[PDB]
């Protein structure tokens, strides 16, 4: 298992514009297109993203390409964030994939706000971090996914995904 297969499991794959768990227009493997309620706006950002008139539908390859760019951007965002980088650098490989997943889902900014959990992670206090991480809107809104990521930080193994 790896970051890609993990996020492919948490996100699914949809080839037509859809709304995500928050009601926002998305496509592919969790590629958010826009926070705007306008379908046209969403279709416009899609065409710009792909480089053609897609009419709201893309192929599997195009979806995978967007996903690769998104995973890459997520990692780079972590490495550029002064609050996240040190945490991430202290982690083992499995736990780093858990940190990437969160950032992918909620943004760098979002993640940078779990101050207390970040410090527990940095300190390798797994169980405590896990309890703190669950005290969040993130966990109350998407609890099955949050539990998989949390267990991943807790144990350092992929069992939640097997
Ligand atoms: Ar992190
Ligand atoms: Ar994180
Ligand atoms: Ar975190
Ligand atoms: Cl893009
Ligand atoms: Cl969920």
d(CA 82, CA 50): 31
d(CA 86, CA 119): 10
d(CA 25, CA 43): 9
Rg (CA), the chain: 16
Annotated binding site for substrate: 32, 104, 117, 132
| Beta carbons within 8 Å of 81's beta carbon, 6+ residues apart | 108, 112
CB atoms within 10 A of CB 109: 11
46 within 8 A of 33, measured Cβ to Cβ: yes
How far the first Cα of the chain sits from its last, in Å, is 9
Ligand 3: residue whose CA is nearest its atom 1: 118
| Beta carbons within 8 Å of 90's beta carbon, 6+ residues apart | 121, 122, 124
Ligand 1, CB within 6 Å, residue ranges:
78, 84, 87-88, 99
**Documented resolution in Å:** 2.0
Helices 93-112 and 3-11 meet at what angle, rounded to 10?
50
What is the set of domains in the chain, with CATH numbers? 1-162 (1.10.530.40)
**For this structure, is 11 an active site residue?**
yes
**For this structure, is 20 an active site residue?**
yes
Catalytic residue among 5, 10, 11, 89: 11
104 within 8 A of 96, measured Cβ to Cβ: no
User: Which ranges constitute the DSSP H helices of 81-142?
Assistant: 85-90, 93-112, 115-122, 126-134, 137-141
CB environment 54-76: b (16+ within 10 A), e (fewer): bebebeeebbbbbbeebbeebbe
């Amino acid at each position: 298992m790896n970051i890609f297969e993990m996020l492919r499991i948490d996100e699914g794959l949809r080839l037509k514009i859809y709304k995500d768990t928050e009601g926002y227009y998305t496509i592919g493997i969790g590629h958010l297109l826009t926070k705007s309620p306008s379908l046209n706006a969403a279709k416009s950002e899609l065409d710009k993203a792909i480089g053609r008139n897609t009419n709201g539908v893309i192929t599997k390859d195009e979806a995978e390409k967007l996903f690769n760019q998104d995973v890459d951007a997520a990692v780079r965002g972590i490495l550029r964030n002064a609050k996240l980088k040190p945490v991430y650098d202290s982690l083992d490989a499995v736990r780093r994939a858990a940190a990437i997943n969160m950032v992918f889902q909620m943004g760098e900014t979002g993640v940078a706000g779990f101050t207390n959990s970040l410090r527990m992670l940095q300190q390798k206090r797994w169980d405590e971090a896990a309890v703190n991480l669950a005290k969040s809107r993130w966990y109350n809104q998407t609890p099955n996914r949050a539990k998989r990521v949390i267990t991943t930080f807790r144990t350092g193994t992929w069992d939640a995904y097997k």
